[PDB]
Amino acid sequence: YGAAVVNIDLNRDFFDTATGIDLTKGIPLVQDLLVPIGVTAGAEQSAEY
Amino acid sequence: LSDDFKQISDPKGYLTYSVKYEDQFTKKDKLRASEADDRIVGPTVNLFK
Amino acid sequence: VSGLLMVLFKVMTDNRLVIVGETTTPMSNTLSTVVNNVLRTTYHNNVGVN
Amino acid sequence: VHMTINERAGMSKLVADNIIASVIKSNWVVDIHDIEYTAEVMTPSEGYTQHVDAESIMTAPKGKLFHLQFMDGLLRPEPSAFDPPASGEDMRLIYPLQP
Amino acid sequence: RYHESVLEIADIFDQADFIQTSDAVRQLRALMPTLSTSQIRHAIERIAQ
Numbered sequence: 001y002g003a004a005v006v007n008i009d010l011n012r013d014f015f016d017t018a019t020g021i022d023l024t025k026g027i028p029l030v031q032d033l034l035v036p037i038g039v040t041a042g043a044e045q046s047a048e049y
Numbered sequence: 050l051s052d053d054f055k056q057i058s059d060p061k062g063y064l065t066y067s068v069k070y071e072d073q074f075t076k077k078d079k080l081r082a083s084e085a086d087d088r089i090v091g092p093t094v095n096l097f098k
Numbered sequence: 099v100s101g102l103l104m105v106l107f108k109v110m111t112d113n114r115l116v117i118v119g120e121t122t123t124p125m126s127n128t129l130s131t132v133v134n135n136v137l138r139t140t141y142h143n144n145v146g147v148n
Numbered sequence: 149v150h151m152t153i154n155e156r157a158g159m160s161k162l163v164a165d166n167i168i169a170s171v172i173k174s175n176w177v178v179d180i181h182d183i184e185y186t187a188e189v190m191t192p193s194e195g196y197t198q199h200v201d202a203e204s205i206m207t208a209p210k211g212k213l214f215h216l217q218f219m220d221g222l223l224r225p226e227p228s229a230f231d232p233p234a235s236g237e238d239m240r241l242i243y244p245l246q247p
Numbered sequence: 248r249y250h251e252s253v254l255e256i257a258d259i260f261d262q263a264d265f266i267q268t269s270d271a272v273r274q275l276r277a278l279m280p281t282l283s284t285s286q287i288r289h290a291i292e293r294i295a296q
Contacts, residue, residue, distance in 0.1 A: 004191045004223055025186050025215060034282055034290050038122025038140070039085065046184050046213045047125060047280065058119030059144045063109070066147050083157055084209045085128035089137070093147050126280030127211035130157055130182070139283055 068096050120144070151178040156206060164206040171241075180205070184213040187244060192224040202241060218244065 010028055015021040020030050029048050035041055080095055081087055120143040126134065151167065153159070170176040183205065190196065200216055208214065254273065257266045282290065 002223075004220065005189055026188055027186050032293055034125075034279060034286055036085075036123060036125040036128075037283075037285055037289065038120070038143070039088075039124060042128075042209075042212065044212045044214070045125070046127060046211045049213070054113050054115040056115040056117045058117055059142070060114070060116055062146075082160065083129075085124055086130075086133055086157070089124070089129055089133055089141065089145060093145070096147050123283050123286060125211065128209060130210045131155055132158070 066096060070098060149176060151176060153178065153180050154182070156180055156182050156208075157210060159206065164203070168202050168206065182210050183208060184211075186213060186215045187218055187246075188215065190217045190219050192219070192221040195219075205242075216242070 009026060010023060012023065015023070015028065022029050022031070027049055031048070032041070034047055075098060077098070080091065082090060082094060121140055122143065123140045124137070129137070153167075167176075167178055171178050196217065196219065198217065200214070254270050256270045260266060
């Protein structure tokens with residue numbers, strides 16, 4: 001009694017870091033898949049989604 | 050047999066640009082405009098300050 | 099006139115092959131629109147002045 | 149006027165301020181597009197945890213998605229009848245258009 | 248009176264055992280940046296390892 005919001009999303013468990021999948025934000029963010037090659041990666045990229 | 054060519058990596062060039070600014074107007078502090086652009090553009094904006 | 103005979107000589111005996119060394123394949127998103135709609139995929143590392 | 153920025157790259161400084169000043173002192177309606185963000189609702193109590201600036205929202209790299217939290221406030225008990233009043237309060241500067 | 252943009256899903260056949268994939272795969276494709284040869288090779292390697 002007194003819950004503000006109760007929303008649904010991807011499971012934090014089934015898709016875990018054992019498969020690279022990481023979602024603290026609410027968005028499934030992987031660390032490397034498609035990337036600039038000659039150039040060094042970025043600290044944050046929209047491509048990581 | 051007949052040794053000839055000698056390979057480089059980045060070519061030189063015979064004709065080049067040379068600038069001569071004067072002070073009272075110049076601002077040698079700011080050399081930035083973007084991120085992955087400041088490495089694709091300037092020097093092509095730092096020789097035209 | 100002697101100095102020009104040195105320029106003409108240097109170009110005459112110039113044998114240089116160009117092996118592609120160094121590159122980048124910039125991710126389509128960061129360099130944007132005006133600078134993106136101008137480069138054909140991969141550029142070098144030492145883009146000069148233009 | 150009703151502004152609409154598409155290229156928030158070559159805009160540079162000084163001009164990035166005349167836009168962010170005319171919105172305050174003239175009631176301009178500005179706009180951005182290349183900005184990408186991940187939004188998550190926030191409970192009325194506990195408040196904000198992170199606050200960004202209006203100068204950084206004009207210099208953020210094209211493909212770098214930052215998160216900016218939005219406040220709720222549907223369930224918040226109003227003040228008691230006896231308490232000190234208020235003077236010229238809050239101004240909010242940003243809005244999502246999704247929803 | 249101009250055109251528009253839609254998708255066909257290859258429903259004009261009605262022969263089974265073919266066209267297994269549906270509309271939705273295309274939508275996912277036209278969302279990422281255009282991948283170069285070396286990027287595709289890298290992306291294959293990463294998912295594999």
